[PDB]
Design an enzyme around this catalytic site. Sequence first.
Site, mmCIF file in Angstrom:
data_model
loop_
_atom_site.group_PDB
_atom_site.id
_atom_site.type_symbol
_atom_site.label_atom_id
_atom_site.label_comp_id
_atom_site.label_asym_id
_atom_site.label_seq_id
_atom_site.Cartn_x
_atom_site.Cartn_y
_atom_site.Cartn_z
ATOM 1 N N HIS A 1 0.818 -1.251 0.000
ATOM 2 C CA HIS A 1 0.000 0.000 0.000
ATOM 3 C C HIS A 1 0.846 1.295 0.000
ATOM 4 O O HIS A 1 0.267 2.358 -0.280
ATOM 5 C CB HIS A 1 -1.034 -0.024 1.126
ATOM 6 N N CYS B 1 3.003 1.968 9.822
ATOM 7 C CA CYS B 1 3.079 1.029 8.664
ATOM 8 C C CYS B 1 4.536 0.925 8.214
ATOM 9 O O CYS B 1 5.214 1.972 8.033
ATOM 10 C CB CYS B 1 2.073 1.300 7.539
#
Length: 182
Positions: free
Chosen positions: A41, A148
């Site tokens: 992502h 992340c």
Amino acid sequence: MGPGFDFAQAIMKKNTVIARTEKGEFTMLGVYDRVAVIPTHASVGEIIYINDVETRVLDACALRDLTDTNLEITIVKLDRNQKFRDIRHFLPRCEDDYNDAVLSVHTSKFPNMYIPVGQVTNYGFLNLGGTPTHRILMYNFPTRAGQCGGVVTTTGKVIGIHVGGNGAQGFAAMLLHSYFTD
């Protein structure tokens, strides 16, 4: 504070860079030579910023398992003038559960961040932002945006990278030795 944090700090200090894409800043784990990993992502392109230096991407591969299911791991080869310490011998060979893990992050926003996340479950299947994903690890910590790409370790093992959370639990994509054979 203890030998869990000791191993984590050793990985962060030599084996991480700050990666910037159009989707933001991520912890990026360097594995060997000029080969690193980041969550898929992050949407890696032909150019990426590494510690604020414009860097060509020599190759980028979004991994999928042999069921053709997302694994949320992108392997990147960087046009960098320096190799990473080879840490492939710290990667697990098989899917597993773990005790006493640390999630470690280093960005402009969250420098030198270390979180004892405790027990890690081989969760397996997760619908991650609407994408069926396999090989997910789960821990019971309310992880936040900015984490992340964070590295999940135990003493002597680098087991995953943080890819999301539901407010109560956090989720990592497994790192396996077989991803990085040359």
